[PDB]
Design a protein around this motif. Structure first.
Motif, short mmCIF file in Angstrom:
data_model
loop_
_atom_site.label_atom_id
_atom_site.label_comp_id
_atom_site.label_asym_id
_atom_site.label_seq_id
_atom_site.Cartn_x
_atom_site.Cartn_y
_atom_site.Cartn_z
N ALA A 153 0.84 -1.19 0.00
CA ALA A 153 0.00 0.00 0.00
C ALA A 153 0.87 1.25 0.00
CB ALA A 153 -0.93 0.01 1.21
N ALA A 154 0.55 2.20 -0.88
CA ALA A 154 1.27 3.47 -0.91
C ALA A 154 0.84 4.32 0.28
CB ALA A 154 1.00 4.20 -2.22
N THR A 155 1.80 4.69 1.13
CA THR A 155 1.47 5.31 2.40
C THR A 155 2.11 6.67 2.59
OG1 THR A 155 3.31 4.14 3.45
CG2 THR A 155 1.14 3.11 3.55
N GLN A 156 1.96 7.20 3.81
CA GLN A 156 2.69 8.39 4.23
C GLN A 156 4.19 8.18 4.19
OE1 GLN A 156 1.54 9.61 8.17
NE2 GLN A 156 2.97 11.34 8.26
N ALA A 157 4.64 6.97 4.55
CA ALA A 157 6.07 6.70 4.66
C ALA A 157 6.76 6.56 3.31
CB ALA A 157 6.29 5.43 5.49
N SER A 158 6.00 6.48 2.21
CA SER A 158 6.60 6.40 0.89
C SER A 158 6.08 7.43 -0.09
CB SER A 158 6.39 5.00 0.29
OG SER A 158 5.03 4.79 -0.03
N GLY A 159 4.99 8.12 0.23
CA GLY A 159 4.48 9.15 -0.65
C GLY A 159 3.81 8.59 -1.89
N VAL A 160 3.53 9.49 -2.83
CA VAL A 160 2.84 9.12 -4.05
C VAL A 160 3.76 8.30 -4.94
CG1 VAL A 160 3.40 11.30 -5.24
CG2 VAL A 160 1.34 10.02 -5.91
N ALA A 161 3.19 7.30 -5.61
CA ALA A 161 3.94 6.47 -6.54
C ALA A 161 4.09 7.21 -7.86
CB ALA A 161 3.23 5.14 -6.75
N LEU A 162 5.33 7.36 -8.32
CA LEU A 162 5.54 7.97 -9.62
C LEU A 162 5.24 6.94 -10.71
CD1 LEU A 162 8.74 7.30 -10.98
CD2 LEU A 162 9.31 8.52 -8.87
N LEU A 163 4.37 7.32 -11.63
CA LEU A 163 3.73 6.40 -12.55
C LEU A 163 4.39 6.48 -13.92
CD1 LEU A 163 1.15 4.52 -12.69
CD2 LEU A 163 -0.06 6.49 -13.64
#
Lengths: 51, 50, 50, 50, 50, 50
Positions: free
Chosen positions: B32-42
């Motif tokens: 899951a993309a979270t606070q600890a990793s930020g937005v996923a660059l697509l």
């Protein structure tokens, strides 16, 4: 490996049958003699794959 | 197709992250993309850091 | 990892079979064929038949 | 290319070269068998010790 | 052509030259027989070496 | 400590395949390559195609 010769065998067999067809048609009127003309194969290989 | 023509139906998106180590793996093979990793660059594969 | 099974397109011997409809290529070329689906296929066997 | 009337395309498989590649492929397979045998040998030698 | 009325034309084949050709072709044929003999001999030493 | 896995960069044997696009080096050199990302790579597998 076989290729090289088995075409050599077939070439020499046709050569012998042309010679026998000449000797059998000796002194039949209006016959013209036959001589087999051969050619060698090559390919993208630099070795020669037969007759 | 039976007329001998292809068509594209999608290009599978890929996603990198800021850090991968802070992903929240849920109860399956997913993260899951979270606070600890930020937005996923697509973006597609074969291009950039994908 | 198996990257790919590569065909080697060196032509073989042109064995003179005495038949008539047995035309064969000995260069870069490829015969074009179709089946009952109308699907295009390509080959190098020359053994042909009415 | 050009294509000949009666002759037929024999295959390009040299029999000798594929036999001597088959021997080497056999020994390659048996040595891959030797490395799986030494890796499950090291796995049970550290499983069997406590 | 130059056409004559009564006289007939014999075959152009010279027979002793064809005897010499049959001797040459017979020893050529058995020399190709000896090369298929030597090359299946190297194929069966590849077989039974194992 | 594992100081490093260093490849043995000696010349391998040059098996002569009759393929046209099977060029190969037997010296110090290296084939320069790119991929679709534009990253530059270097190889010695000279098996080539279109």
């Amino acid at each position: 490996s076989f290729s090289q010769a088995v075409s050599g065998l077939n070439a020499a067999a046709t050569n012998l049958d042309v010679i026998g067809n000449n000797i059998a048609n000796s002194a039949t009127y209006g016959f013209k003699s036959g001589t087999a003309s051969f050619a060698d194969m090559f390919a993208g290989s630099k070795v020669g794959l037969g007759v | 197709y039976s007329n001998e023509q292809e068509q594209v139906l999608g290009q599978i998106v890929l996603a990198n992250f800021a850090n991968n180590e802070g992903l929240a793996s849920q109860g399956d093979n997913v993260w899951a993309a979270t606070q600890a990793s930020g937005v996923a660059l697509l973006g597609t594969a074969g291009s950039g850091n994908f | 990892k198996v990257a790919g099974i590569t065909q080697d397109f060196t032509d073989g011997t042109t064995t003179n079979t005495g038949r008539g409809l047995d035309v064969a290529i000995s260069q870069n070329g490829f015969f074009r064929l179709v089946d009952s689906n109308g699907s295009v296929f390509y080959s190098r066997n020359g053994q042909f038949k009415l | 290319g050009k294509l000949t009337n009666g002759a037929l395309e024999a295959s390009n498989v040299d029999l000798s070269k594929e036999l001597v590649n088959m021997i080497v492929a056999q020994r390659n397979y048996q040595s891959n068998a030797q490395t799986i045998k030494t890796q499950d040998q090291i796995l049970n030698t550290l499983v069997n010790l406590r």
